[PDB]
Design a protein around this ligand. Structure first.
Ligand SMILES: C=C1CS[C@H]([C@@H](C=O)NC(=O)[C@H](CCCCN)NC(=O)CC[C@@H](NC(=O)[C@H](C)NC(C)=O)C(=O)O)N=C1C(=O)O
Ligand SMILES: [K+]
Length: 355
């Protein structure tokens, strides 16, 4: 890389790895549209496998950006509308609380207090219908935001219903394959297992456990090369040749709701750039309910934005940020779940120094 990039990334990430005891890390910076890669540590401590540009990391909540874009692509295809009632796509959802809950609400965590996780004792398609039928909202729809894998995960499952495809098949054919994300996976194939990093949680090697709507909310594993390509695609959607996908990326960066200085997209979250770095979590907050103000109608993707998403599984911590008006971006993938503020701090320190 150019020495300026080299030096800001290594002076920022080296002490981050130290302080947070991160076993393994990959970083990509996208600087004038062009990726630059950096790796440290181990992907598997016991087997002494290093992190490389081909290491797969669990993206956790960053997976939601893929679900938001796949949903955007389905809207652009005319298969769904965000204004549609949920019940249009799941008619057996007959319980009265669902009257007035739209796909917009599900995609943006505004349905009225759907939980962070679907309960572990929900396995089957009948178990999932009972869970949603029996769920009692705390709030009226479109009033309060509570980040929820049960919310955006249901959005993703319903958004693909009119295509006739499974969620994975729609994701593969409509998002991963057009963007040449050939080492990005909902289910890691046997051939790629040698590249799949272990996560580490209290010294113990761990992968993300199966659960209900886990592909749709937190199930994507990717490399630092494919995640750099995902940032480039989201920075510059008009270079994408597949029309509905280009439009789906644009819809995922539209501003649907405002809480404080943040704006809720489909998966992506946004602030106005330039951004105060204390204004940009899990500083160990298990549940953070916030009032939202509708942006009526949604603002199309603002190029002067800090667009980002954090992500965690038990063993992994991910972070993606980018600034369309500067052609700048960053992906940080780690095999430890370390505090969200340390992620945002390091990302800001890097990108600020490069504009
Ligand atoms: C801020 C949010 C919004 S929703 C967001 C969301 C996206 O990243 N989180 C998840 O999907 C969470 C991650 C929780 C991190 C450690 N507690 N759940 C999962 O990924 C799946 C369940 C998870 N199950 C577990 O029992 C734990 C966390 N794993 C281990 C190894 O102990 C697993 O890894 O298999 N999590 C939070 C939160 O409060 O932790
Ligand atoms: K599943």
């Amino acid at each position: 890389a150019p020495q300026q990039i080299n030096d800001i990334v290594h002076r920022t990430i080296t002490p981050l790895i130290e302080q947070q005891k991160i076993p393994g890390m990959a970083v990509a910076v996208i600087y004038q549209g062009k990726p630059y890669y950096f790796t440290w540590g181990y992907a598997d401590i016991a087997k002494k496998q290093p992190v490389t540009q081909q290491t797969l990391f669990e993206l956790g909540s960053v997976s939601k950006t893929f679900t938001g874009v796949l949903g955007g692509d389905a809207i652009a295809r005319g298969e769904i509308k965000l204004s549609d009632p949920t019940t249009k796509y799941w008619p057996e959802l007959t319980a009265k609380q669902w009257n007035g809950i739209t796909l917009l609400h599900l995609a943006t965590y505004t349905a009225g207090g759907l939980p962070l996780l679907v309960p572990d004792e929900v396995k089957s398609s009948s178990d999932l219908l009972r869970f949603y039928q029996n769920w009692q909202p705390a709030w009226a729809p479109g009033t309060q935001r509570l980040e929820a894998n049960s919310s955006i995960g249901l959005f993703g499952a319903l958004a693909v219903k009119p295509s006739g495809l499974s969620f994975e098949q729609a994701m593969q054919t409509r998002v991963f394959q057009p963007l040449k994300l050939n080492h990005t996976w909902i289910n890691v194939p046997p051939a790629e297992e040698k590249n799949y990093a272990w996560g580490y949680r209290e010294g113990k090697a761990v992968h993300v456990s199966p659960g209900a709507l886990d592909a749709e909310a937190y199930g994507v594993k990717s490399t630092i090369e494919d995640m750099a390509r995902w940032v480039q695609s989201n920075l510059k959607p008009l270079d994408i040749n597949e029309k509905t996908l280009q439009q789906g990326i644009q819809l995922a960066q539209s501003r649907y709701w405002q809480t404080g200085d943040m704006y809720q997209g489909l998966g992506w979250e946004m602030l106005d750039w330039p951004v105060n770095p204390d204004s940009i979590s899990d500083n160990k907050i298990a549940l953070a309910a916030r009032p939202v103000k509708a942006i009526t109608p949604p603002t199309p993707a603002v190029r002067a934005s800090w667009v980002h998403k954090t992500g965690a599984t038990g063993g992994f911590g991910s972070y993606v940020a980018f600034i369309p008006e500067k052609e700048l971006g960053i992906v940080m993938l780690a095999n430890k779940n370390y505090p969200n503020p340390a992620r945002v701090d390091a990302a800001w320190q890097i990108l600020n120094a490069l504009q």
